[PDB]
Structure formats: C-alpha cells, structure tokens
C-alpha cells in the first residue's frame, strides 16, 4: 500500500518497495542537454491496435488510476522482442492545478499522460511475471495538453462514472487504440527506466512520443473529479488526483531521440 500524498507518498515508497530507491527510475525531465540522436530508432508498428467496436474491454479503478485491459494480440513490432499489450491507464493533476503529466519537457508538465503498457511476450507469459525481470516491459507515453475535445479519449472518459471507486469495473466498447496516439509517432524519445509506480522495477523500455495530443478542459475536469482511490464503503474516502511521480535523477543515462 502506497499513495501520491503524505506518509505513504513517493518519498516513502522505497521503505516497502526497494526498487523505488534504486537506479534507472522514471519519470524524467526531457531537456536538450541529455538528448542524443540515434539512427537505430526506426518507426514502431502498432499491430492489432484496431479493437472491434462490437467487442468489450474491461475498464477498472485499481485505486491508483483508471486502467483499460488490452488483449495480448495487440502488440508492438520494432523492438528487440515482441512486446504484447496488457493495459493502458492515465496520470493527471487536479481541477486547481491541471498539470499532472509524469514526464516533463524542459521542466514543463503537460495536463496529463497516457501509458500503454506492454510485456515481453517472447520471454514471459504476462506483465505480472515480466515486471521484475530483465527486458520485461515497454510503455508508449502520450503527453496530453488541454485543447480541443477528443472523441477518441472520450471512448474512455464517458465510462468513468461506472468506475468511481476502487475495484469497480465496467465493459467499454473496443475502438482503434491508435486514435490515442499523436501525429508523427516516428518522432519519439527512448530511454531505460522503471515503473513510475511501486514496485518501481527498472525493467521498462520507455518510448515517449515527441508530439502531444489534446483533450478539452471539460474532459480533464471529468477525469480529475470522477475517481476515488478508495472503496465505495471507505469512511476516509480519497480523491484520485495528482497521481504522478516527481521526475527522478538521470543516474548517468541519456535519452535517445529518433529526431535531430
């Protein structure tokens, strides 16, 4: 058990989850001095992203974020192994401070952040088994900026009202998960890092897209007001807000870019 605020917050994670106080932690601040162009970084292909709108996918409040379960037929080609999808989820701030991206760019938070989590299906049978193992995970990160209404993101946000409390679950119709990605997915940052949550294992190949996507003010307000970290019956209910980790020391890492 852990939170983003007070005694159980991120400065205390390492007391229960030692990897949280180890090396190669995420997120990080993307800034010119630590960037390095790499000709190796070829375009990813997103296979099986186009989920049938006549099929149903489990959305869950896990007490930390809202998660959408993804089928393992969904995958990434282009890395050293096949990375199969396990779930996507978000990180955001609060109505009075809508700047809850995990990754920052030249010291600036975006409004929110989407993480599409994949596991090494060539090595491991699921994300859970893969999470504490070498080369176990790969995440696509989309930075989210406040702008126009996003009908694609709304295929998640219109469902939040059925997963208000921890452990609540709701079937959501499939849609093309590629619609959540920004323009020019060929332009990305790539670095070796960790889960941004406990148990913080340094097993994550990070891809952060260069370009953000936009969702409206009304979409962020809904995301920032709809969810609780706590069970429906908890007498000390806590709002699910500011569910982002502070950026971490580089530990001599560089971030490789597909662009110069």
Ligand X SMILES: CCCCNC(=O)c1cc(S(N)(=O)=O)c(Cl)cc1SCCc1ccccc1
Annotated binding site for Zn(2+): 89, 91, 115
**Is position 20 an interface residue for ligand X (rule: CB under 6 A)?**
no
| Phi and psi at residue 220, to the nearest 5° | -65, -45
Which of ligand X, Zn ion, its own copies, none does residue 117 bind (CB under 5 to 8 Å by kind)?
Answer: ligand X
Residues 6+ apart with CB under 8 A from 30: 103, 104, 105, 106, 189, 208, 255
Helices and strands, counts by H and E, the chain: 4, 16
Q: Is residue 75 involved in binding Zn ion (CB under 5 A)?
A: no
Interface with Zn ion, residue 103, by CB under 5 A: no
70 Cα distance to chain centroid: 13
Question: Counting contacts by CB under 6 A, is residue 118 touching ligand X?
Answer: no
Rule CB under 6 A: choose which of 75, 82, 115, 155 binds ligand X.
115
- State the binding string over 138-177 for ligand X (x if CB under 6 A, else -): -x--------------------------------------
Quick check: 202 and 194 in contact, CB under 8 A?
Answer: yes
> Is 64 part of the annotated catalytic residue set?
yes
Distance of CA 5 to the CA centre of its chain: 19
State how far the alpha carbon of 86 is from the alpha carbons of 140, 204, 231, 252, in Å. 12, 14, 24, 30
Q: Tell which one of 133, 147, 179, 250 touches its own copies (CB under 8 A).
A: 250
What is the spatial distance between Cα 135 and Cα 199, in angstroms, rounded to a whole number?
16
b/e burial code for range 51-69 (CB count within 10 A of at least 16 → b): beeeeebebbbbbbbbbbe
Q: Which is nearer to Zn ion, 150 or 197 (CB)?
A: 197
- Give the pair of three-digit tokens for residue 148: 């126009």
Residue count, binding to ligand X (CB under 6 A): 16
Of positions 69, 72, 81, 99, contacts its own copies by CB under 8 A: 99
Region from 31-39, 72-80, 111-119, 181-189 binding Zn ion, contact rule CB under 5 A: 111-119
Interface size with Zn ion, residues (CB under 5 A) = 1
Query: Which of 84, 104, 201, 258 is close enough to bind its own copies by CB under 8 A?
Result: 104
CB 38 within 8 A of CB 217: no
Spell out the residues 6+ positions from residue 74 whose beta carbon is closer than 8 angstroms to its own: 47, 48, 49, 51, 84, 85, 177
Residue 164 interacting partner from its own copies, ligand X, Zn ion, none (CB closer than 5 to 8 Å by kind): none
Question: Taken in order 46, 50, 55, 61, is the CA torsion positive or negative?
Answer: positive
Residue choice 78, 187, 242, 256 for contact with its own copies (CB under 8 A): 242
Residue with smaller CB distance to ligand X, 119 or 153: 119
Which residues fall in the annotated binding site for substrate? 196-197
By CB under 6 A, name the binding residues for ligand X.
62, 64, 86, 89, 115, 117, 127-128, 131, 137, 139, 195-197, 199, 204
Active-site residues, by number, are 64
């Amino acid at each position: 058990k852990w939170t983003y605020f007070g005694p159980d917050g991120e400065n205390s994670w390492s007391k229960k989850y030692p990897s949280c106080g180890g090396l190669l932690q995420s997120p990080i601040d993307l800034h010119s001095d630590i960037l390095q162009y790499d000709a190796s970084l070829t375009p990813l292909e997103f296979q099986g992203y186009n989920l049938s709108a006549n099929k149903q996918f489990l959305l869950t409040n896990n007490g930390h974020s809202v998660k959408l379960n993804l089928p393992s037929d969904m995958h990434i080609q282009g890395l050293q192994s096949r990375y199969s999808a396990t779930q996507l989820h978000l990180h955001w701030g609060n109505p009075n401070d809508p700047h809850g991206s995990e990754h920052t760019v030249s010291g600036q938070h975006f409004a929110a952040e989407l993480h599409i989590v994949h596991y090494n299906s060539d090595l491991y049978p699921d994300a859970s088994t893969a999470s504490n193992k070498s080369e176990g995970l790969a995440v696509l990160a989309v930075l989210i900026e406040m702008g126009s209404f996003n009908p694609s993101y709304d295929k998640i946000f219109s469902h939040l009202q059925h997963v208000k409390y921890k452990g609540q679950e709701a079937f959501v119709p499939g849609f093309n998960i590629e619609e959540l990605l920004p323009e020019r997915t060929a332009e990305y940052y790539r670095y070796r890092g960790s889960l941004t949550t406990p148990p913080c294992n340094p097993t994550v190949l990070w891809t952060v897209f260069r370009n953000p996507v936009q969702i409206s003010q009304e979409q962020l307000l809904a995301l920032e007001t709809a969810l609780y970290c706590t069970h429906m019956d908890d007498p000390s209910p806590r709002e699910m807000i500011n569910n982002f980790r502070q950026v971490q020391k580089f530990d001599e890492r560089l971030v490789y870019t597909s662009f110069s």
